[PDB]
Design a protein around this motif. Structure first.
Motif, PDB file in Angstrom:
ATOM      1  N   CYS A  42       1.195  -1.520  -0.203  1.00  0.00           N
ATOM      2  CA  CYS A  42       0.182  -0.029   0.113  1.00  0.00           C
ATOM      3  C   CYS A  42       1.113   1.492   0.119  1.00  0.00           C
ATOM      4  O   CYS A  42       2.260   1.341   0.299  1.00  0.00           O
ATOM      5  CB  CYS A  42      -0.817  -0.165   0.905  1.00  0.00           C
ATOM      6  SG  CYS A  42      -2.369  -0.569   0.760  1.00  0.00           S
ATOM      7  N   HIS A  57      -8.700   0.605   4.380  1.00  0.00           N
ATOM      8  CA  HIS A  57      -9.040  -1.118   3.732  1.00  0.00           C
ATOM      9  C   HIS A  57      -7.535  -1.401   3.111  1.00  0.00           C
ATOM     10  O   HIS A  57      -7.541  -3.009   2.927  1.00  0.00           O
ATOM     11  CB  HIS A  57      -9.866  -1.146   2.069  1.00  0.00           C
ATOM     12  CG  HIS A  57      -8.943  -0.394   0.805  1.00  0.00           C
ATOM     13  ND1 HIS A  57      -8.617   0.803   0.432  1.00  0.00           N
ATOM     14  CD2 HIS A  57      -8.207  -1.228   0.553  1.00  0.00           C
ATOM     15  CE1 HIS A  57      -8.379   0.928  -0.184  1.00  0.00           C
ATOM     16  NE2 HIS A  57      -7.479   0.288  -0.857  1.00  0.00           N
ATOM     17  N   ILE A  99     -16.942   0.315   0.953  1.00  0.00           N
ATOM     18  CA  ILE A  99     -15.736   1.146   1.447  1.00  0.00           C
ATOM     19  C   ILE A  99     -15.660   3.196   1.657  1.00  0.00           C
ATOM     20  O   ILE A  99     -14.822   3.519   1.344  1.00  0.00           O
ATOM     21  CB  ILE A  99     -15.016   0.686   0.195  1.00  0.00           C
ATOM     22  CG1 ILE A  99     -14.542  -0.172  -0.098  1.00  0.00           C
ATOM     23  CG2 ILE A  99     -12.938   1.227   0.330  1.00  0.00           C
ATOM     24  CD1 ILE A  99     -13.993  -1.386   0.928  1.00  0.00           C
ATOM     25  N   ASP A 102     -12.921   5.562   4.270  1.00  0.00           N
ATOM     26  CA  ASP A 102     -11.667   5.137   4.431  1.00  0.00           C
ATOM     27  C   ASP A 102     -10.599   5.562   4.454  1.00  0.00           C
ATOM     28  O   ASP A 102      -9.755   5.790   3.522  1.00  0.00           O
ATOM     29  CB  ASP A 102     -12.042   3.967   2.349  1.00  0.00           C
ATOM     30  CG  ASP A 102     -10.910   3.076   2.926  1.00  0.00           C
ATOM     31  OD1 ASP A 102     -10.682   2.534   3.586  1.00  0.00           O
ATOM     32  OD2 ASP A 102     -10.305   3.277   1.175  1.00  0.00           O
ATOM     33  N   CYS A 187      -4.465   4.162 -11.461  1.00  0.00           N
ATOM     34  CA  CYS A 187      -3.851   3.239 -11.728  1.00  0.00           C
ATOM     35  C   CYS A 187      -2.243   3.228 -10.643  1.00  0.00           C
ATOM     36  O   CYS A 187      -2.103   2.131 -10.585  1.00  0.00           O
ATOM     37  CB  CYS A 187      -4.036   1.795 -12.285  1.00  0.00           C
ATOM     38  SG  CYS A 187      -4.787   0.868 -12.455  1.00  0.00           S
ATOM     39  N   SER A 191      -3.265   1.186  -2.985  1.00  0.00           N
ATOM     40  CA  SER A 191      -4.356   2.077  -2.539  1.00  0.00           C
ATOM     41  C   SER A 191      -3.512   2.419  -1.140  1.00  0.00           C
ATOM     42  O   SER A 191      -2.762   2.283  -0.694  1.00  0.00           O
ATOM     43  CB  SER A 191      -4.343   0.009  -1.369  1.00  0.00           C
ATOM     44  OG  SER A 191      -5.477  -0.150  -3.274  1.00  0.00           O
ATOM     45  N   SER A 210      -8.851   4.752  -2.771  1.00  0.00           N
ATOM     46  CA  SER A 210      -9.859   4.121  -2.310  1.00  0.00           C
ATOM     47  C   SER A 210      -9.667   2.621  -3.194  1.00  0.00           C
ATOM     48  O   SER A 210      -9.630   1.668  -2.723  1.00  0.00           O
ATOM     49  CB  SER A 210     -11.198   4.315  -2.128  1.00  0.00           C
ATOM     50  OG  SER A 210     -11.458   4.815  -0.749  1.00  0.00           O
ATOM     51  N   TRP A 211     -10.477   2.742  -4.816  1.00  0.00           N
ATOM     52  CA  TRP A 211     -10.444   1.782  -6.177  1.00  0.00           C
ATOM     53  C   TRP A 211     -10.159   2.449  -6.772  1.00  0.00           C
ATOM     54  O   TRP A 211     -10.399   3.256  -7.028  1.00  0.00           O
ATOM     55  CB  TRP A 211     -11.410   0.959  -5.962  1.00  0.00           C
ATOM     56  CG  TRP A 211     -13.067   1.524  -6.591  1.00  0.00           C
ATOM     57  CD1 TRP A 211     -13.578   1.223  -7.381  1.00  0.00           C
ATOM     58  CD2 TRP A 211     -13.748   2.126  -5.474  1.00  0.00           C
ATOM     59  NE1 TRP A 211     -14.422   1.847  -7.391  1.00  0.00           N
ATOM     60  CE2 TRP A 211     -14.996   2.270  -6.197  1.00  0.00           C
ATOM     61  CE3 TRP A 211     -14.229   2.090  -4.070  1.00  0.00           C
ATOM     62  CZ2 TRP A 211     -16.343   2.705  -5.462  1.00  0.00           C
ATOM     63  CZ3 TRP A 211     -15.371   2.852  -3.276  1.00  0.00           C
ATOM     64  CH2 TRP A 211     -15.975   3.555  -4.297  1.00  0.00           C
ATOM     65  N   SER A 214     -11.304  -1.528 -12.576  1.00  0.00           N
ATOM     66  CA  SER A 214     -10.340  -2.970 -12.154  1.00  0.00           C
ATOM     67  C   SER A 214      -9.995  -3.459 -13.632  1.00  0.00           C
ATOM     68  O   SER A 214      -9.044  -4.622 -14.211  1.00  0.00           O
ATOM     69  CB  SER A 214     -11.449  -3.696 -12.466  1.00  0.00           C
ATOM     70  OG  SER A 214     -13.208  -3.513 -13.542  1.00  0.00           O
TER      71      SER A 214
ATOM     72  N   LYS B 171      -5.432 -12.426  -8.751  1.00  0.00           N
ATOM     73  CA  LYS B 171      -6.477 -11.714  -7.358  1.00  0.00           C
ATOM     74  C   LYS B 171      -7.046 -12.795  -6.482  1.00  0.00           C
ATOM     75  O   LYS B 171      -7.529 -13.408  -6.151  1.00  0.00           O
ATOM     76  CB  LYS B 171      -7.699 -10.732  -7.875  1.00  0.00           C
ATOM     77  CG  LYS B 171      -7.535  -9.925  -7.981  1.00  0.00           C
ATOM     78  CD  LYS B 171      -8.512  -8.927  -9.065  1.00  0.00           C
ATOM     79  CE  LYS B 171      -8.701  -8.106  -9.128  1.00  0.00           C
ATOM     80  NZ  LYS B 171      -9.900  -7.060  -8.997  1.00  0.00           N
ATOM     81  N   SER B 214     -18.893  -7.065 -11.626  1.00  0.00           N
ATOM     82  CA  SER B 214     -18.829  -5.481 -11.453  1.00  0.00           C
ATOM     83  C   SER B 214     -20.200  -4.549 -12.470  1.00  0.00           C
ATOM     84  O   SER B 214     -20.920  -4.471 -11.935  1.00  0.00           O
ATOM     85  CB  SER B 214     -17.867  -4.687 -11.589  1.00  0.00           C
ATOM     86  OG  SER B 214     -17.433  -4.611 -12.797  1.00  0.00           O
TER      87      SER B 214
END
Lengths: 241, 241
Positions: A42, A57, A99, A102, A187, A191, A210-211, A214, B171, B214
């Protein structure tokens, strides 16, 4: 706070695809969080010599270490500070299923030695207004999760929560803020890593990672913990410990 | 355990799109988890009259309530049991960042009264082998997150972890198992809800809902906590408390 001794250089390439490499030491509050084994999991941000702010998280515990002053995670050559964590303060309002809220604070066992490459980001006041469309910066080694091992940076604009809901729907809560979807990915932020905006010559921590998309889409914004909503809790925690 | 007094009826429609409505009371271990305000946020499964197993990322606390015997969450007419939680036992190996070892046990303050519509699912032995391609069933009110308020069910096949990695990459950990992507969605399962397979006339808990597509894709599998990997911890916890 908020004024790096080594000034960041941000080019047009920070605005597209996956951002670009940072100037070494130019984001001096950025820390890496390593577990018992030395594995980077992280990010976080120094807010003074004794305290790091990161995301809840991440699930940080006192067997993890905070690593300050880093640029190249593949170099065993650069001066870094590996700092032990004495106590973890997870925000009690954290909802591990949405979340929301956070944020976690880490109190170090021994103070970091601030320098040209290790210093603190500024925190906002609860009442500060960072408007939609403001260009802000996210930094981290988040691309290693998939590749450069040197610290990356990207410039990306804040979104209003209403416009962010067009992408993420009902997962967006008030203690959240979104940035990006402008043709650059989010990206590169780890995190728990920082999203900072430059207010009156000083860089201020506006979000915590946080996120994100994907698939690291360049048309999908990152979602961050909104620091204005959580800074009162931050200051209450520092004053009581 | 594992033998409902009211037998499930599973048709071809349980295999496509979003599944189909269950026969009322035919999944008697399925419980709903409600917070202080009556809001349904997660699922779980009774494993005896005093213990419910759910997912750790639900973040259940003792101010939440376990609701047993439910079918229609919009009906105030059906006989249900609202049960207080005396203690929460989150698996200490839970990694809140990868969602690995995603299991929590809830010990009730007072026992549920088992009946035709309230009874326990069977747990597997750690050594049981549920092979890839086995048809299993997931149930829950997970479609309300987006719509019917009656309990839904879907039939979907297990995947080997190697084949599941083609969808989710790195993952996927060993304490995880995937099911679906067969032309039916996995989103009817609530977070923490059951994935059961019928072994020798009895339904056995093979997975606990961790996360899914998702977008509720019919070509993307759900990811579950693999109960074989966590059942020893379950039995150790029951014996010590």
């Amino acid at each position: 706070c908020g004024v790096p001794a080594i000034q960041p250089v941000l080019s047009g390439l920070s605005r597209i695809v996956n951002g670009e490499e940072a100037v070494p030491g130019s984001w001096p509050w950025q820390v890496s969080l390593q577990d018992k084994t030395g594995f980077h999991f992280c990010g976080g941000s120094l807010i003074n010599e004794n305290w790091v702010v990161t995301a809840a998280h991440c699930g940080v515990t006192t067997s993890d270490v905070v690593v300050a002053g880093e640029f190249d995670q593949g170099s065993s050559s650069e001066k870094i500070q590996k700092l032990k964590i004495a106590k973890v303060f997870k925000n009690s309002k954290y909802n591990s299923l949405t979340i929301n809220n956070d944020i976690t604070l880490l109190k170090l066992s021994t103070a970091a030695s601030f320098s040209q490459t290790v210093s603190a980001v500024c925190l906002p006041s609860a009442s500060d207004d960072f408007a939609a469309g403001t260009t802000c910066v996210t930094t981290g080694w988040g691309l290693t999760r998939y590749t450069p091992d040197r610290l990356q940076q990207a410039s990306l604009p804040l979104l209003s929560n209403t416009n962010c809901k067009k992408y993420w729907g009902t997962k967006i809560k008030d203690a959240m803020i979104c940035a990006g979807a402008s043709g650059v990915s989010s990206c590169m932020g780890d995190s728990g890593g920082p999203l900072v905006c430059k207010k009156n010559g000083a860089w201020t921590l506006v979000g915590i990672v946080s996120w994100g998309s994907s698939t690291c889409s360049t048309s999908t914004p990152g979602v961050y913990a909104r620091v204005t909503a959580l800074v009162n809790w931050v200051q209450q925690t520092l004053a009581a410990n």
